[PDB]
């Protein structure tokens, strides 16, 4: 997934 | 081996103190240069037109002329005409006085980069050293003998690391294509993101530095890396140098702030404001695939000797 | 949630009044910040190196720091050193002082964006707030005591719409080659010109706004669109922001001024000086093919709700 | 009918000013030497044009040199992109010409304008590339909108113009041949003429007094008063710059000597014992250092331009 | 009951400086010649007023000329709207008068200034339109906060004021006939007397040394030291304006020639091998260009005003 | 003899 | 002999  | 250069940048007390702290500088002295006659002292200074100048004798194999010049440009006002701080007048004009014409292309290349960055022409003058007249003894090492003496500049900047981008030019796009792993290339050149916890430096906490994998440009100190569960390596700030990061607004379903390297404009990751409040509060969430870790004990041999002793806080 | 940011941009009388008029700001004051001593006043100001600063307390829910900053750069000279309007001196130097260190990422993003668009680093300094000494009482809300007092800035700019270019990044070339009609691509990307009266909006005159077909970035207000007999959509001025347009010298068998969009750099048409003189005399002659009309009603859901309050002046 | 283009800040004031100068036939305002031949008040900042005043004059009544002098009299020679509060490139100062034939007149004025200030002037000088007429509400803006913005004093267009260049000093050889012995001793050797036996001591006829050694105008007959001191006495010179002051300690006294501007002729001394109503000053001038030119012969003498200022 | 208004930058230092000048009876600071009737330190920056200092003096004790000299000694005369580190029209230089009888004195000092500098000065001279007293916290500011913001050496007001007007240089001929061939060749030519046989090489007596050519004071005895280089040697002159310096490449060497101000007489050279504790300078002067005046005969001569300075 | 004011 |  992505960085948040 | 030895080399010297004469620099004029405002009251020579501050400037001499500042350079006495630069690694590679062997000896300094202050004096009066390029006036209209080969005679002067403090009392005749305003009449003779000399510039308060600092003599910098350095070991060119430890620090370069180019590097002394970059150090010089970080602490002086390059636009100011006949003035630096409260001191106004021609004896305070900025100038770079040389002796060996073979040194000019290096001097002017720094001047041009400095101007392209500022967007305008700098007032610093560069000419051949005509004569240098040692100033009276009470002026020599003034700030050493008289702490709490007048000093416009922050002699402290002398101890901040200097990363010269010229050492980390970005290779042709095809050389990067051939040199990086498909992942580092995707991440670094196409802004992709490596997987959350399977990345190489997520749990790495050894002494040393983290470099831009596309150019070799130093980016982070191990001392600024911290424990995070996000999955990707996290730092509280770029290598004691703000200039090293480009910040861009990003939207990928959300609203973030992406970060890239200065010299290679490589996609590094993103920065968040939920990091340890004691370290500054920021979290530079960085992809491992966009970095090369250089252990403290391999730094010298890897061409990063100058970044020791910046490793300790 | 609420935060605070400190802005120095010249005489604070005009700067505070300006920020008081901004949606989201709930409390402003003026003072002296980052001097060389812990205290000063209006008399010792020129001696303490303090910068006239305006404190802006705002509601992050209504206005973002990024937005406050955009409003700041539209009222100050970004390249001027120690001067704004006719006030010269360090107390008038530009500066963005932050309390919360988590504000950096946003501040840096805005600073670098300004620079990238100017080609050169700006004169605005950004640093930690060391101390903020509240100014004497006669300075606080000065303009809100002297409605016609002195002021070198147009506080009625704070009530003008602000379009954030980040919200409309230029799609990829390829994606455009596929998303745009053959007509729209040729006009927008190759500077072609659509037919005189057969274009879509030549006779369109409905409430709403005209947008950049290539990016979605707002360009003109239906209220500035006037009846022209040239055959192409014609407006007297870009959407209450002259920053939305880039002008270029064009020599296509004649000498004309070509007009392109800020984000997206889309060829829009040409501007002439024969429009209604009661409206500025300008005539922005635009290809319907570069635009996308958005009716007032389908505007909110289209994501241009913030412009609804400006549709009808 | 000749023409020159002047950029000196807000064209409203500059045009009003030149519209008052004698010899000027037509006046207009526009934008010049920008980066494109299209622009207007709204596009000004984008196009880089300079606010300019078009001056169409009778070169036989007023010369290009004179127009330029009137020009330098009202602007700031050293300001960069600024006159008054108005800052910006549209307010940059400049002289735009078409016939490079009058470049020599232009540069002479600039050179001597630079000798005076020392520093080089910021005025821009270049070939007129294009001139775009401004909107009609800008034309004769002050004649139709009095009390409008105006940084300069348009009344300065009335103050007489006394060009030193028309009165340079002749070689020492010719002065020996054209000045009487006394006029030469007084003038070149700082001597003094006997009290009441001089020519103009008791003269009070209409006209002016000129420097005998150069012809440069010095005093109006209207500023002359009877003091019974013995020498012609005036309360003030035609204009302030026509006199140079020197400390004079000779003859066991402490006085202030006065000399003419162009030729540097010793004229006499100035005291502070004159008619309190006239100013209190007494310019005690030697008759032998002056040449009286009556009203009726002023015109042929080459001073027709001062006839309008003879009256009180 | 005699006064003059001076604008020379931040008025704090300017007032402290003038209050310390023998002859000044009272001083006060304010705002003058602006574009509006009144103002205050708040609206100053917008009313176009100039920070001014009011000097009330005893015409009998100190002259308007002397006051102006002390004025020009402490301001930057070529600077436009700036003194020290203060920028703006409120810091512009100006001399504001009330009576026209003061013009001769003012103009004389102004032109002398422009002659010495060879260029027009930025100091404006105009009639006082209106002087508004400044808020009480400004009045006598340094007289309350002895250690406050001040960008001018306030003690210069105590250093001697030597007026060049009092020592006019004699004609070239009157000189060649009045001084020895020795003094003439040395003083009017680049001649240098014999090393040890001159009159003042060994002299060490209380008094002052004067320009043999004009009588203009040059050196105090207290600044003379034992050198044995052959010619009288001083560590410095009375005032810095008294000496002019020039590059001398003659006799196969590169040194600094020294000449007197008024009179421009050759005196000798200056080196940097003088006593360190005294500044390090060695002004090597020919005895032939000086006239020693002992303390006794000082008052009788015209140098009594210098007696208070002979003491270390 | 010479010009003198009062 | 001159000054030196």
Residue numbers in the entry:
A (entry chain G), G (entry chain F): -1 to 2
B (entry chain C), C (entry chain D): 0 to 312
D (entry chain A), E (entry chain B): 1 to 312
F (entry chain E): -1 to 4
Give verbatim lines from the article:
Oxidation of Met to methionine sulphoxide (Met-SO) damages the proteins and can alter protein function. Two distinct Msr enzymes have been classified for the reduction of Met-SO: MsrA reduces the S-form of Met-SO and MsrB reduces the R-form. However, enzymatic studies demonstrate that both the enzymes share a common catalytic mechanism based on sulphenic acid chemistry involving two (or three) cysteine residues.
In this study, we report the first crystal structure of MsrAB from S. pneumoniae (SpMsrAB). The linker, iloop, of SpMsrAB consists of 13 residues (residues 159–171) and, interestingly, contains one 310-helix and several hydrogen bonds to both the MsrA and MsrB domains that could restrict the positions of both domains. Interestingly, Mol A contains an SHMAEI hexa-peptide and Mol B and Mol C have an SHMA peptide in their MsrB domains, but there appears no peptide bound in Mol D. This structure results from the crystal packing. Interestingly, as mentioned, our SpMsrAB structure reveals a complex between the active pocket of SpMsrB and the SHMAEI hexa-peptide, and is the first report of the structure of an MsrB complex with the product Met. We compared these two conformations and found that SpMsrA occurs in two dramatically distinct conformations relative to the centre of the iloop, while SpMsrB forms a complex with Met. Kinetic analysis revealed that the apparent Km value of SpMsrAB for Met-R-SO is 20-fold lower than that for Met-S-SO and the catalytic efficiency (kcat/Km) for the R-form is sevenfold higher than that for the S-form.
